[PDB]
């Protein structure tokens, strides 16, 4: 075995937009990771259908970065709710190992379709 991140990670909360300051209150299940040097988010999920931008607040509050996203992917989930659709995003420049980590954890801990 070479495996893909046994010990998992924790958390998903905050905001998003489409043109810079379009992030108003909260439009993202911005997912995972509070690293040892500080909070560094990995994955973004969107109950909406089209977003190019987000703004995650952290530590100082004054430092909250206007992140550039990437073209999305879509899937349906096997939640107890039933029909639930989001459009998946990753923060741009996210290397392959991190996407594998979040995809594996999301698929193996919670049920999807």
């Amino acid at each position: 075995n070479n495996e893909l991140s046994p010990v998992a990670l924790r958390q998903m909360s905050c905001a998003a937009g489409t043109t810079q300051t379009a992030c108003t209150d909260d439009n993202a299940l911005a997912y995972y990771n509070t690293t040892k040097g500080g909070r560094f988010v990995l994955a973004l999920l969107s109950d909406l259908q089209d977003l190019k931008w987000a703004r995650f607040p952290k530590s100082d509050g004054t430092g909250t970065i206007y992140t550039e996203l990437e073209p999305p992917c879509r899937f349906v989930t096997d939640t107890p709710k039933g029909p639930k659709v989001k459009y998946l995003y990753f923060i741009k420049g996210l290397n392959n190992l991190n996407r594998g980590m979040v995809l594996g954890s999301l698929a193996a801990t919670v049920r999807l379709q």
Partner: protein, 311 residues
């Protein structure tokens, strides 16, 4: 009674299956091989001891042994279904070994087996480990690998200082006979990555899941995602294999007319000095899924680490 001579013709498939056991009955076979492990309590690149496998060598017309093995492994029933599903998703790739799932009883109970067909004796980590941990006191694996692929003959090692680089500089020519095998392995790896991306499968690629013909197997640590959104992790694979690419001169075939070792050389004009597009084409052909920006000209790098990476 039965068992051994019935397991033999059950492992025996439908193609030709002229098999002979590797000194076993219905029990497993134990070997000493190199692996690349990461399982939250152990890590490293060392030589462990395999335990759960039965191997059957294959014969041919004149009843002399050949370099083909039927290596069946025994594991869990949940793993049975998981591997069967992943293989069913991945079976159409021409770079995936042919699996065969069946059930056979060893006792009153019935246990499942997974059989892989036409593998080689050694993998590509065995070769990497042999070349990266050289010891002239005991190098049986390297000698066996060299003689089974017509790189030299068994009496080449009767010489002394046959391994030295300053004395006997002919060992470079001897080593440069594996470059084509390495190049075909690289191409099959790229094919496998494309298939995994198209099928929507997430996993990490290691050197011990590929044999010396390029075929892939062992989908036991993979997961499933929506089609078109797969992602392979290929850091350790390329990083560990890198030093062997220049020892064996694997990219020699790229200086010929049609990337064919039987045609004359390419004739570039003497006034050309840029070659900035050929480097990008080579990177896209052999290192497609290595995810880190590559600068052909190191004047565009961001720091010294990027300079090292691109150089």
């Amino acid at each position: 009674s039965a068992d051994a001579q019935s397991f033999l013709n059950r492992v025996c498939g439908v193609s030709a299956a002229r098999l002979t056991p590797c000194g076993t009955g219905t029990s497993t076979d134990v070997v000493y091989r190199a692996f690349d492990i990461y399982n939250d309590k152990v890590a490293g690149f060392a030589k462990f001891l395999k335990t759960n496998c039965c191997r059957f060598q294959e014969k041919d017309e004149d009843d002399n042994l050949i370099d083909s093995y039927f290596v069946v492994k025994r594991h869990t029933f949940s793993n049975y279904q998981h591997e069967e599903t992943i293989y069913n998703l991945l079976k159409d790739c021409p770079a995936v070994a042919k699996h065969d799932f069946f059930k056979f009883r060893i006792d009153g109970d019935m246990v499942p087996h997974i059989s892989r067909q036409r593998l080689t004796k050694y993998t590509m980590a065995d070769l990497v480990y042999a070349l990266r941990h050289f010891d002239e006191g005991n190098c049986d694996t390297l000698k066996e690998i060299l003689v089974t692929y017509n790189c030299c003959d068994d009496d080449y090692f009767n010489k002394k200082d046959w391994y030295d680089f300053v004395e006997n500089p002919d060992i470079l020519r001897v080593y440069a006979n594996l470059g084509e095998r390495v190049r075909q392995a690289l191409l099959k790896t790229v094919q496998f990555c494309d298939a995994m991306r198209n099928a929507g499968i997430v996993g990490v690629l290691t050197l011990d899941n590929q044999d010396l013909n390029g075929n892939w197997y062992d989908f036991g640590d993979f997961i499933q995602t929506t089609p078109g959104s797969g992602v392979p992790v290929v850091d350790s694979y390329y990083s560990l294999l890198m030093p062997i690419l220049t020892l064996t001169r694997a990219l020699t075939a790229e200086s010929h007319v049609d990337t064919d070792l039987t045609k004359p050389y390419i004739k570039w004009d003497l006034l050309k000095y840029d070659f900035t597009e050929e480097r990008l084409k080579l990177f896209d052909r052999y290192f497609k899924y290595w995810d880190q920006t590559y600068h052909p000209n190191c004047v565009n790098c961001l720091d010294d680490r990027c300079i090292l990476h691109c150089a």
